[model samples]
Target: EIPLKYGATNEGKRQDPAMQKFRDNRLGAFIHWGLYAIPGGEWNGKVYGGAAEWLKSWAKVPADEWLKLMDQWNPTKFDAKKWAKMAKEMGTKYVKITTKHHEGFCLWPSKYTKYTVANTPYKRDILGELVKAYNDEGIDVHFYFSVMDWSNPDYRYDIKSKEDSIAFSRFLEFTDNQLKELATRYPTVKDFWFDGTWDASVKKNGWWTAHAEQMLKELVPGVAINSRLRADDKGKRHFDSNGRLMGDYESGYERRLPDPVKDLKVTQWDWEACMTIPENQWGYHKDWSLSYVKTPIEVIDRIVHAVSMGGNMVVNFGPQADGDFRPEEKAMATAIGKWMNRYGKAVYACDYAGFEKQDWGYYTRGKNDEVYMVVFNQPYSERLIVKTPKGITVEKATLLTTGEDITVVETTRNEYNVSVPKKNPGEPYVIQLKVRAAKLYRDALT
Candidate 1:
């Protein structure tokens, strides 16, 4: 192993209560709002199909011209309570709001910079309002802060000279001040999800990354940080030079997830996966026709998929320029809310079941010898195949949507056939299994 000063702080998964809460909060919502939302991916009447959050770069607009969008940055329909309620209705335990995107516009009125809401016509502490509203609604809040500031002149992609080093040092200090401001202002924040730290400037200053993580933990006790924020002494991001995760949890699974069967190693540590409804859009785009959108069922499948492998899933929502969510997003939230109301027990506080993945659906283990089978596919066979690990027997099975008993038949040493619900619930459902482990009870008998 390489002797490094900026290696992983934690060697394995954290067992602290706050970390447990982060893991148990399997479902979350991502709010990607910024000055880019004002343009809605269009510049001078020509619509760009790229990501709306990166519209500044896509349109080749200079920092001076792009910051002018602040003049029109009036999200009149924006209501913190409404946003919180929508997240609540969607059954998300937390909401990750963008405090600052790469474009360097601050949603909160940061005293460190003039390119903030405080300088805008609609001068309001939008980030603070969101944190309070979400907290009041009993939902945890997370801050998505981008370390790379495109608008900042001191931000250097790489340090090839003394001048570059000095400028980048100033930029790093500015970033630290912003982070400190966030921690002090939003003391209730549970996590900091860092992005835009993939440049050479950040990689070379890996020591600063370690310091940032320590500083946040000191400022906000038990606050979790993402792996994307760290780089080791040898410039290894996420995993260190010795193949260890650097942050509190792995945040590399963006817009995708680990393979359930082939990538079981991820179960050893905490990880989260974030995905956009549209194929590639994370911010509001005027013409959604530019890309394919995921259906509600498809999104639900992804959420269940992640939890089945002991990971959290965050769904993205790009609010419109008018500060209101699109009809598609509203409908998506409603559908997910209804589904969670019925089958959330399979997700919340659940972990990966030490059983083989089934063709019907994924398996999640809850407290008490309880195993949940979230069935997304009801085969024509009408019997769900279950293969328990060694020394485990399925004693009983019950449908979660309906308190109806399901039949279970032992077919072999550790295999069983579970019956599907007699009446089709017409959506993804859960089947809870009561198992008797011979291995665990054997010690008592001995």
Candidate 2:
């Protein structure tokens, strides 16, 4: 087990004020834009209906063949400010941009490799522009970097001899150099969402992943690293069950969250879930007919699920090759932004409320000792049934959006059913409970 330490105390706890800043900025947007956006999952005149981001591997395109796309890497309409504005309007506290994916196309000009944006026709610093724009809007920036680079000749899936180790060691050094470049170039980065490290090359030399984590923390103090970046002896990505976690947080729960009642213990660690608009596409796929597209309400429910589980939800955005979001994505963002503008207080900086599934909705708590009951599925009756645990009294209840008084009637010593208006609200509403304790219940399920 790697005894990871953070801050000046060296106690492994992320007590740094900057790390706290990241924790407070719970909601974020994940941007996946690259050369793959141009093809949109088509290769050799045949359209492969997988995630556009993984088209290189899915289509079995060689490194040279794939790198050829860089010649046409001209995003004529790409505007960093506009992208940042969209993120701000979506009410995200931070923005995580894919600086480099498995294809090894660096958005920034990394001096370590020639397969970077600097060598493309659109020789502009995409990462630098994004960092500036997000920072200008007072939003934190995080870089999503891939450790598995297909462009490098040293990349090997399996190794048997000492010579293989020498070659793989060179690859590790190359990765380290590029990471250092990213940290130095974008000094204001808040986190590193490492992906594409699931290959056997990375799992065999998992120590390098830990080394990368330590190096990033040293270079950029308090920068958070996701757990997808790590691998163990068994090639497990996230947790070892021996109480050893690789990165600062668990990050493999993409498009899913822990069960509210079944996985309450998940709050013991920091985690985040990334989701897509369509069922499988993480990058811009021109066609949506091939996958199951989620509605705005469905997406909102998923976001609520994550927040209720004490984890952050990152909605992915895949910009077109022309540097514009799809119409459906824009609509989804607007819907989410509207909802958040009204009831986001219930989500931001809130922890799991330890309440079991009720007929009304899920429950979350804020740092100010306030409990928010988010009603997604309204009760069949006019009155909302809520059971407060023992020894806690519901002093008052108010609608979060309208600030209107909600009548709270005490039943048992610690139970109460808060009544809603006879007319239902048009959208999902939150009932704020001003509690006097750290948590209103010891364990609602127990």
Candidate 3:
């Protein structure tokens, strides 16, 4: 392997208590709020059928014109306690807030920039209030910071000249200061999810990414960092030249997920997946009918799928400019909360089951020998086929939502037919299985 200073800080998944708590809290919510929420995907009387958060880029508006939206920023309905209550009722153990998006608008009052909440009508520490409210609700907060600042003239896409190098040097320093400020102010933050680092400017200066990771960790002890925040000396992002993940967890699973059966490499380390409720929109859009919106069942399926592969899932909510969630988002959160309230034991503190992927649904193993089968699709045969590893036998099966017993029939060695619940719930349901090593059964292949 080529020697590099900024390859990977650690070799494997962190086993510290804080990192374990982060992994245990499987469900999370994302708040994508910024100046773009004011436009809500429309510019100059024309609606752009693209990502709402990227409305500035879609309309090709100048940075000065885009930053002007900060003057109009006033969320009359913005209540920190209400936001925290919403997240709590949604059953999300944590919330990832966009402190700043690529549009270069700072939600928090940063002394480093004039384009912040301090200068706006909503001149308040939005980030601080959010941190306090979420923590009060017993929810962890993760900051989502973007390194690419369109509002900054010093920001460069690529360092092609000496002038470019000097400008970016200042830009990098400014970025460092903002990050340091974030870490210093919000000491209780659990994780940092960095975005907009895909530019050639950031790639060329991979050292800064490594420095940012170190700096944040030093400031906030046990703070988790996403792999997207790092790059190697060779300018390779996420995975290094040695093909190892750079930061604490892989963050490439954005708006998409790795195939559970085919992409088993994710099980080797910690990773997280973030999903947008509407297709391709992370920020508030004026009209969600522009794209196909995901139903709560679909969202729940993705959440279960991620947990089944030893990863966490963060569902995204794009709050409107009025600081109120859209009706669809509110309903979605309620539905997920209802489902999680019933089958949370299968999710919280659960890890990927070693069992092979089944046709019925995903499998999650909890502490001890308890394994849960989250059945999404009920089989016509009424028997959920479970093929276990050699010498393992299903001792008992029961419904998770209810204590009703489920029939477990052993038709062959290391395999069992688990019957579906007597009452059809008509939605995603979970089954808990007690398994043990069969002392009487011997492996024929061994």
Candidate 4:
């Protein structure tokens, strides 16, 4: 094993109060808003549908040319309170917003850079307004910061020569300064969601990753850092030399989720997965005709699937350049809110229940000791197969929304058949179980 100064600090996930909030808030919303929203994936009148945020790179536009988009950066309809309200209605306990994406545009006015909202026509601190508004709505805020700044010339892809080292050293200092500014500026921020750290420069200068994580914690105590930001002295990313997770939670799951049956090992640790509404677009794109957009039900299924595996899932919403959520996104938010309002118990503060996953549904253990069967697939048998541990038994089964009793038939020891509602729910629903531990063994000793 390589003896390294910047190895992982902890053996596993944290148990702090802040960390607990991170776990308890099982659902989150990810907002990708930036200067890219201006052109929205078009350059020279040509449209590129692959991740609208990466338009600058996709269209091969120069950095200086991209910076000119700042002149058009004005989202008049963007109400922080309204965004927070939409998130709240969607039953998201937290929100993750892009402080700075690959485009290198700071949402807030930073003392370090002119490429910020302060210098833009919309000369207002967007991050500050969001922090206050989301906090006011009783929602936690997390920042997504990108390390690969296409706008910064000093940023290095790799360090080979001494000149490269010196210049990159200056860039690292600038990066540190910006991170410190964010930490102090938004004290309520709970987590740092880092991206673009897979560069050879980041891997070689591994110490910088650890230093960044440590420095931010020192700046604001108990702030969670994602695993994507870390690399050990030996260039091992995410996990350390000893194979221990570096950051507070695993973050490799993005735009996709783990396979529920085959990937159960992920449940052993804290992790988060962010997904886009459209098949590929993270930021606003003028034309979504090129990609398939996920319906609200599909998004809901992903959320439930993530929670059932004891991980967090954040649905991405990309607002238009006018600061208003696109019609499809708004409809999705309303539909998800309607479902969450009725069966939210199956989601918020829920974790994986140690039950054999059935074809019909996934099992979630609610914070209040109720076991929820989130049924996405209604079986033709009109029965949901459920199995409990040897000493555990279900005292009662009922519909989560109505609290009406469901029929339970014990087929054998530790196994039972739970009947569904009389009418086919016709939609996804949750079956709540009131369970208890019981002893079936007789005390036959004299």
Candidate 5:
């Protein structure tokens, strides 16, 4: 069982009013923009086929060598309003921007660090602009901060003596200062989606995790934080080795989802799955040839898969050096927006319907006693088959898009074969069903 704190309830769902607003705003965008975007996965003219954000480590470049890239930090076409508009157009209710990644490059001009945007040619505060722009567009803004800093000298992976602790303590203080600045500077921020805390240095100092969470809450009244920020008493990352969740939500499902059959238990907790456009590229990689890029339909299916299982789906975007998105990324955002515009009610503010998958499609439900069946693959066989539990009668069956009443033929005991429209609507269509009670609809397989 996971312990609950300020932002989460005893049941593990986010409880804070602002966090509830966040959870209700299920579809979100993750921006992984930084100095890494400048290189776009290349090091000294050789393109390293890895996550562009992790190119420094992939190339084994020293801190000083990597820091020199800041000299080239000039985004001529960086327009915060345009980016915010794109996010709004993509139908994302919120956006999480990487304030600082593992590389320790601060997008905002922090007073504590000379190695920030202030020192670069683009002296303006990038994050400050984004926060204001996104907030203006009615999109909640969340900050993604990395605890691991490669630029700091006091960072130690393995320590053999007490002297290392003394040095590391100073680094921890510096980290606290940076975090405090972010919290206080952007008081309107809704969540803190931390990353890059898996290093041994952070695990050794797990107490700081609780401290940071408490401090952020004290500073910002209702900001949501993720489980990645914590370490257990025994210093294990992710979940504690003993199997307890540490933060507001489980955040380890990157580019993957829990199996519906085997991992249905995870639905009891608040979790999120973040996926990349390309197979494994979280940051901007210049070459799309090296990665298997996902189409809009594939990405939409993943989003539906997550929502159907009671989890949020965060789609990632890596902006180019000019602060503009790649054409493919823009097309994806538009495509997703188009779909969400028509059938987002099935996704937003909906929870998992505890029914087994049928030949029809996945099931999701809203708080208002409405059930939605998202049909991804229409079976070749003419009729759609669905079996209700017992004693529950389907009041109405209608297409969500056109509001046309669909014909339902009750076949066996508690079994009904739904009829499809002669001219099927394009895209993933939602079949809205008005049901009585959740327990009434039992799965035939069960």
Candidate 6:
């Protein structure tokens, strides 16, 4: 293993009360708001069905031209309290807001640069209002900051010359200052979710990443940083040369999930995965007809899937230029809210249950050792097959939504057949199991 100066400061997951709060509140929301929402993937009158956030790069718009869009950035309907209320309705424990995307437009007024909300037509601090609103609604606030600033002339993708080194050094200092500013301004923030640090300029200076992490943690005690912000001296990221996770939690799972059975190893560490409602879009797009949008049930399954595998799942919401959520996302909020309203006990404070993966669905365990069976698939045989390890015996089963008992029957050694409800349980449902292990418990016979 290659040793490095810049690596994970902590060898394992943080176990502080702040970390526990972040983990227990498993579901979150990702809000991607920026100047790109103005164009919505259309550049120079040509429709590009790619992510609207990257419209500047896709359309080859110069930095100067892109900055001009800020003059017109007036989101008249932007209301942070309303947004926070919706998040509460959607049952999100936290909200991750884009303080500054790759475009470098700061949502909050920053003294570091003039390209901020302070200079915009809507002169209010969007991020400040959001933090207060979410915090008031009893939801944690996390900042999503992109290190690679495309708007900054000093910013470089790679550093090859002395001139490049000096310019990029200034950029790095600017980044550090912005982070410090954020830390001092928003002491209530719990986590820092970084992005756009995948470049030679930042990776080559990986030591700074470690320093930035320490600075933030010092400024705000119990603050969690993402693995995306780190790189070793050898340019290895997230995991070190020794393969230890770099940040407090793993942030690698984006828009995709690990295999329920094969990727069970992820449960060993704290990790989070963020998903967009659309196929690939993170920012707002005027025409969602260009892509496939995930239905409410699909999103719910993903949330349950992540929690079942011991990870937090954040569903993304891209608001329009007018600051209103699209009809599709609004509907999803209502649907997911309804689903969570009934069966939230299965998700919150739950982790991977050391049970054999069966055809019925996934197994999630709560802090109290109560195993929850999140049934995504309705079995036609009227019985859900549950195969426990050799030592464990299935005692009783109860539906979490209705508190109704589900009949259980032992089949063979270490296996049992669980009966379904007398009436149909609409959509996805949860079954709480009380098991008695003989001596020891093993996950599965791989």
All candidates: TM-score: 0.97, 0.93, 0.97, 0.96, 0.93, 0.97
Over 4 Å off in model 1, which ranges? 439-446
Clash number by candidate, in order: 0, 0, 0, 0, 1, 0
Prediction 5 TM-score vs. true? 0.93
lDDT of 6 by residue, 1-446 (tens): 67678876786667889999999999999999999999998987898877889888889999889988999899999898899999999999999999999999999999999899999888999999999999999999999999989889999999999999999999999999999999999999999999998888888888888998999989999998998898888888888878888978999888888998899889889999999898878899888888788999899999999998999999999899888898899999989999999988989999988887887788989899898888889999999999987788889999887788899998888888899888888778888999886761112100
List per-prediction Cα lDDT, in the order shown: 0.91, 0.82, 0.92, 0.89, 0.83, 0.90
Candidate 4: misplaced stretches above 4 Å?
440-446
Query: Could you give candidate 4's per-residue lDDT for residues 1-446 as a string of tens digits?
Result: 66878877876668889998999998999999998898888888898756788889888889999989999988888899999999999889999999999889999999998999998778999999999999999999999999989889999999989988998999999999999999998899999999989888889988999999999999888999999999999888888888788888989877778888889898888999888887778889988788777888899999999999999999998889999998888899999999999998888888988777888878999877789999999888888899896688988899988878899999888888899899777789999998888871111100
| Cα RMSD for candidates in order | 6.6, 5.2, 6.2, 7.6, 5.4, 4.8
lDDT of 5: 0.83
Candidate 3 segments exceeding 4 Å error: 440-446
**lDDT string, candidate 3, 83-140, tens digits:** 9999999999999999999888898889899999999888988999999999999999
Local accuracy of candidate 2 as per-residue lDDT tens digits, 1-446? 44433211122536578866776677889999888999998887888887888899889989999999999998889898998899989989998899998899999998888888899888999889999999999999999988878899887776678888889899889989989988987899989998878777777766677778889989997889888887655555566434566687778787667877788777777778888888878889888888789998788888888888878889999999888888998998889999999889998888787655676778888877788999888776667777766556678899887788889887666677888855688788888988654251111100
Q: What does candidate 5's lDDT look like per residue over 248-325, in tens digits?
A: 778888888888768988887878788889877877899988868899989999998898888889999999988899
Provide the global lDDT of candidate 1 against the true structure: 0.91
Best by lDDT: 3
Candidate 6 segments exceeding 4 Å error: 439-446
Off by over 4 Å in 5: 1-11, 389-391, 438-446
Candidate 2 stretches with Cα past 4 Å from truth are: 1-13, 232-236, 437-446
User: Which wins on TM-score, candidate 2 or candidate 6?
Assistant: 6
- Which prediction has more favorable TM-score, 3 or 4? 3
